[PDB]
PDB file of C-alpha atoms and ligand atoms in Angstrom:
ATOM      1  CA  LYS A   1       0.750   1.550   2.606  1.00 46.53           C
ATOM      2  CA  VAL A   2       4.176   2.891   3.607  1.00 43.27           C
ATOM      3  CA  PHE A   3       6.705   0.059   3.118  1.00 42.42           C
ATOM      4  CA  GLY A   4       9.828  -0.549   5.138  1.00 42.96           C
ATOM      5  CA  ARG A   5      13.114  -0.519   3.216  1.00 42.21           C
ATOM      6  CA  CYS A   6      13.796  -4.249   3.473  1.00 42.86           C
ATOM      7  CA  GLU A   7      10.102  -5.139   3.134  1.00 40.99           C
ATOM      8  CA  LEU A   8      10.081  -3.318  -0.195  1.00 42.32           C
ATOM      9  CA  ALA A   9      13.371  -4.856  -1.285  1.00 41.91           C
ATOM     10  CA  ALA A  10      11.986  -8.348  -0.665  1.00 42.34           C
ATOM     11  CA  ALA A  11       8.808  -7.561  -2.578  1.00 43.53           C
ATOM     12  CA  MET A  12      10.764  -6.166  -5.501  1.00 39.34           C
ATOM     13  CA  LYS A  13      13.091  -9.197  -5.516  1.00 39.35           C
ATOM     14  CA  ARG A  14      10.138 -11.630  -5.492  1.00 41.40           C
ATOM     15  CA  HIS A  15       8.666  -9.792  -8.498  1.00 45.14           C
ATOM     16  CA  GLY A  16      11.862 -10.037 -10.548  1.00 44.76           C
ATOM     17  CA  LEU A  17      13.474  -6.559 -10.346  1.00 43.80           C
ATOM     18  CA  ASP A  18      16.904  -7.641  -9.059  1.00 40.77           C
ATOM     19  CA  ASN A  19      19.264  -7.100 -12.013  1.00 39.20           C
ATOM     20  CA  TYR A  20      16.319  -6.480 -14.370  1.00 40.93           C
ATOM     21  CA  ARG A  21      17.929  -4.908 -17.472  1.00 42.89           C
ATOM     22  CA  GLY A  22      21.163  -4.801 -15.514  1.00 42.61           C
ATOM     23  CA  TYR A  23      19.865  -2.653 -12.643  1.00 43.73           C
ATOM     24  CA  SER A  24      20.706  -4.261  -9.314  1.00 45.34           C
ATOM     25  CA  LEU A  25      18.014  -4.230  -6.653  1.00 40.36           C
ATOM     26  CA  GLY A  26      19.440  -1.258  -4.713  1.00 42.31           C
ATOM     27  CA  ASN A  27      18.731   1.039  -7.698  1.00 44.65           C
ATOM     28  CA  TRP A  28      15.020   0.336  -7.457  1.00 45.30           C
ATOM     29  CA  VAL A  29      14.863   0.801  -3.706  1.00 44.10           C
ATOM     30  CA  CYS A  30      16.794   4.100  -4.023  1.00 45.89           C
ATOM     31  CA  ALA A  31      14.420   5.377  -6.700  1.00 46.93           C
ATOM     32  CA  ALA A  32      11.317   4.460  -4.682  1.00 46.92           C
ATOM     33  CA  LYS A  33      12.716   6.237  -1.617  1.00 49.17           C
ATOM     34  CA  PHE A  34      13.207   9.566  -3.395  1.00 46.95           C
ATOM     35  CA  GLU A  35      10.125   9.307  -5.648  1.00 44.36           C
ATOM     36  CA  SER A  36       7.500   8.464  -3.056  1.00 45.34           C
ATOM     37  CA  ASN A  37       9.188   7.953   0.320  1.00 47.58           C
ATOM     38  CA  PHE A  38       8.039   4.314  -0.035  1.00 46.66           C
ATOM     39  CA  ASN A  39       4.344   5.377   0.104  1.00 45.99           C
ATOM     40  CA  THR A  40       2.082   3.524  -2.327  1.00 43.96           C
ATOM     41  CA  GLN A  41      -0.535   6.346  -2.121  1.00 43.28           C
ATOM     42  CA  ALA A  42       1.821   9.178  -3.273  1.00 44.74           C
ATOM     43  CA  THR A  43       0.538  11.433  -6.055  1.00 45.75           C
ATOM     44  CA  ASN A  44       2.083  14.556  -7.596  1.00 50.72           C
ATOM     45  CA  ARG A  45       0.760  16.818 -10.316  1.00 56.36           C
ATOM     46  CA  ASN A  46       3.068  17.838 -13.162  1.00 56.78           C
ATOM     47  CA  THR A  47       3.148  21.250 -14.847  1.00 57.90           C
ATOM     48  CA  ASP A  48       1.584  19.891 -18.048  1.00 57.10           C
ATOM     49  CA  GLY A  49      -1.523  18.572 -16.205  1.00 56.28           C
ATOM     50  CA  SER A  50      -0.393  14.929 -15.980  1.00 58.01           C
ATOM     51  CA  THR A  51      -0.061  13.217 -12.566  1.00 58.64           C
ATOM     52  CA  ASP A  52       2.541  10.833 -11.130  1.00 59.60           C
ATOM     53  CA  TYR A  53       1.174   7.807  -9.197  1.00 60.93           C
ATOM     54  CA  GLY A  54       2.356   5.334  -6.577  1.00 58.36           C
ATOM     55  CA  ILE A  55       5.613   4.076  -5.169  1.00 58.17           C
ATOM     56  CA  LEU A  56       7.557   4.682  -8.389  1.00 58.32           C
ATOM     57  CA  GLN A  57       5.672   7.863  -9.409  1.00 56.00           C
ATOM     58  CA  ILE A  58       4.571   6.535 -12.789  1.00 54.57           C
ATOM     59  CA  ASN A  59       3.242   9.308 -15.051  1.00 53.60           C
ATOM     60  CA  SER A  60      -0.239   9.416 -16.626  1.00 54.00           C
ATOM     61  CA  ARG A  61       1.187  11.178 -19.680  1.00 56.03           C
ATOM     62  CA  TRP A  62       2.378   7.767 -21.009  1.00 59.03           C
ATOM     63  CA  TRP A  63       1.725   4.828 -18.733  1.00 56.85           C
ATOM     64  CA  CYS A  64      -1.726   4.728 -17.139  1.00 57.63           C
ATOM     65  CA  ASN A  65      -5.238   6.132 -17.585  1.00 54.23           C
ATOM     66  CA  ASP A  66      -6.647   8.670 -15.064  1.00 53.06           C
ATOM     67  CA  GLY A  67      -9.400  10.212 -17.216  1.00 53.49           C
ATOM     68  CA  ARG A  68      -7.956  13.724 -16.838  1.00 53.80           C
ATOM     69  CA  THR A  69      -4.769  13.842 -18.994  1.00 57.09           C
ATOM     70  CA  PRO A  70      -6.098  14.584 -22.496  1.00 58.53           C
ATOM     71  CA  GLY A  71      -3.929  13.437 -25.294  1.00 56.43           C
ATOM     72  CA  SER A  72      -2.026  10.919 -23.156  1.00 56.14           C
ATOM     73  CA  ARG A  73      -1.241   7.216 -23.591  1.00 54.83           C
ATOM     74  CA  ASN A  74      -1.898   4.208 -21.360  1.00 54.95           C
ATOM     75  CA  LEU A  75       1.066   1.914 -22.242  1.00 52.70           C
ATOM     76  CA  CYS A  76       0.741  -0.273 -19.118  1.00 50.86           C
ATOM     77  CA  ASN A  77      -2.999  -0.807 -19.897  1.00 51.24           C
ATOM     78  CA  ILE A  78      -4.085   0.049 -16.337  1.00 55.60           C
ATOM     79  CA  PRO A  79      -6.096   2.676 -14.427  1.00 58.09           C
ATOM     80  CA  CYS A  80      -3.602   4.943 -12.608  1.00 55.52           C
ATOM     81  CA  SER A  81      -5.511   4.145  -9.401  1.00 55.93           C
ATOM     82  CA  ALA A  82      -4.207   0.569  -9.615  1.00 55.88           C
ATOM     83  CA  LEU A  83      -0.740   1.984  -8.973  1.00 55.74           C
ATOM     84  CA  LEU A  84      -1.817   3.205  -5.540  1.00 56.37           C
ATOM     85  CA  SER A  85      -2.591  -0.295  -4.189  1.00 57.70           C
ATOM     86  CA  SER A  86      -0.816  -1.800  -1.217  1.00 56.58           C
ATOM     87  CA  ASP A  87       0.209  -4.686  -3.513  1.00 56.94           C
ATOM     88  CA  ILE A  88       3.010  -3.400  -5.794  1.00 58.38           C
ATOM     89  CA  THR A  89       2.476  -5.941  -8.581  1.00 58.85           C
ATOM     90  CA  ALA A  90       0.984  -3.370 -11.010  1.00 56.64           C
ATOM     91  CA  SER A  91       3.703  -0.829 -10.318  1.00 58.13           C
ATOM     92  CA  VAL A  92       6.469  -3.401 -10.803  1.00 59.94           C
ATOM     93  CA  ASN A  93       5.021  -4.769 -14.010  1.00 60.67           C
ATOM     94  CA  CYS A  94       4.641  -1.279 -15.427  1.00 62.54           C
ATOM     95  CA  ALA A  95       8.187  -0.241 -14.284  1.00 64.10           C
ATOM     96  CA  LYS A  96       9.548  -3.206 -16.234  1.00 65.72           C
ATOM     97  CA  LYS A  97       7.993  -1.760 -19.351  1.00 68.33           C
ATOM     98  CA  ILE A  98       9.333   1.733 -18.658  1.00 68.79           C
ATOM     99  CA  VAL A  99      12.933   0.660 -18.032  1.00 70.50           C
ATOM    100  CA  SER A 100      12.888  -1.402 -21.264  1.00 71.54           C
ATOM    101  CA  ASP A 101      11.942   1.632 -23.441  1.00 68.59           C
ATOM    102  CA  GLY A 102      15.507   2.853 -24.134  1.00 67.21           C
ATOM    103  CA  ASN A 103      16.391   5.415 -21.413  1.00 63.18           C
ATOM    104  CA  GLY A 104      16.761   2.860 -18.648  1.00 61.38           C
ATOM    105  CA  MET A 105      16.227   4.227 -15.162  1.00 62.68           C
ATOM    106  CA  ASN A 106      16.973   7.733 -16.441  1.00 60.36           C
ATOM    107  CA  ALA A 107      13.148   7.780 -16.877  1.00 62.35           C
ATOM    108  CA  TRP A 108      13.050   8.584 -13.148  1.00 61.02           C
ATOM    109  CA  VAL A 109      14.527  12.076 -12.563  1.00 61.55           C
ATOM    110  CA  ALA A 110      15.151  11.275  -8.872  1.00 66.84           C
ATOM    111  CA  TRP A 111      17.119   8.170  -9.829  1.00 69.48           C
ATOM    112  CA  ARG A 112      19.303  10.126 -12.256  1.00 69.35           C
ATOM    113  CA  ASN A 113      19.913  13.003  -9.816  1.00 69.20           C
ATOM    114  CA  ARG A 114      20.151  11.106  -6.486  1.00 68.45           C
ATOM    115  CA  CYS A 115      20.922   7.365  -7.131  1.00 66.35           C
ATOM    116  CA  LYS A 116      22.913   7.114 -10.379  1.00 64.37           C
ATOM    117  CA  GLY A 117      26.594   6.924  -9.758  1.00 62.05           C
ATOM    118  CA  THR A 118      26.246   6.296  -6.054  1.00 61.59           C
ATOM    119  CA  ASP A 119      26.708   3.240  -3.862  1.00 63.06           C
ATOM    120  CA  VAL A 120      23.189   1.856  -4.385  1.00 59.55           C
ATOM    121  CA  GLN A 121      23.909  -1.476  -2.692  1.00 61.50           C
ATOM    122  CA  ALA A 122      23.733   0.501   0.557  1.00 60.72           C
ATOM    123  CA  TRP A 123      19.924   0.516   0.110  1.00 60.29           C
ATOM    124  CA  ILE A 124      19.654  -3.233   0.584  1.00 59.70           C
ATOM    125  CA  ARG A 125      22.313  -3.594   3.275  1.00 58.91           C
ATOM    126  CA  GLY A 126      21.026  -5.613   6.214  1.00 60.82           C
ATOM    127  CA  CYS A 127      18.073  -7.109   4.405  1.00 61.47           C
ATOM    128  CA  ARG A 128      17.423 -10.853   4.366  1.00 62.09           C
ATOM    129  CA  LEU A 129      17.028 -11.637   0.735  1.00 61.96           C
TER     130      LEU A 129
HETATM  131 CL1   CL B   1      22.278  -3.406  -5.301  1.00 65.45          CL
HETATM  132 CL1   CL B   2      14.926  13.844   0.805  1.00 67.95          CL
HETATM  133 CL1   CL B   3      -7.066  10.717 -19.941  1.00 71.24          CL
HETATM  134 CL1   CL B   4      20.291   0.763 -19.425  1.00 72.24          CL
HETATM  135 CL1   CL B   5      20.425  12.603  -1.937  1.00 69.26          CL
HETATM  136 NA1   NA B   6      -2.744   8.417 -19.727  1.00 68.30          NA
END
């Protein structure tokens, strides 16, 4: 599923991401836009053999099991394929673990390079929340 901007913002707000660990909702929408273009089926292979999955491009090196990343962890206790679902519950629940691990949203390279330090509230402008 390819979400609309405000459709995704509402889903993220319902699932508790607005001001989660101090990150206002527009940060999360901005990161999803540049990680996956709001497409829950996005996948991208990394140079080390791991794969990124879903709307927030969560990596199999640490967070989910795909059966093809030897030596990796599964900290969200989920098959990576669950992250490709049209329902974003698994992705949100796993993102909450990631952002709580110490590096905040710097865990997402696109957030650090394209969202950090910008006017992120622009990403939720116009939405009915
Ligand atoms: Cl915001
Ligand atoms: Cl772009
Ligand atoms: Cl594996
Ligand atoms: Cl932080
Ligand atoms: Cl940009
Ligand atoms: Na893994």
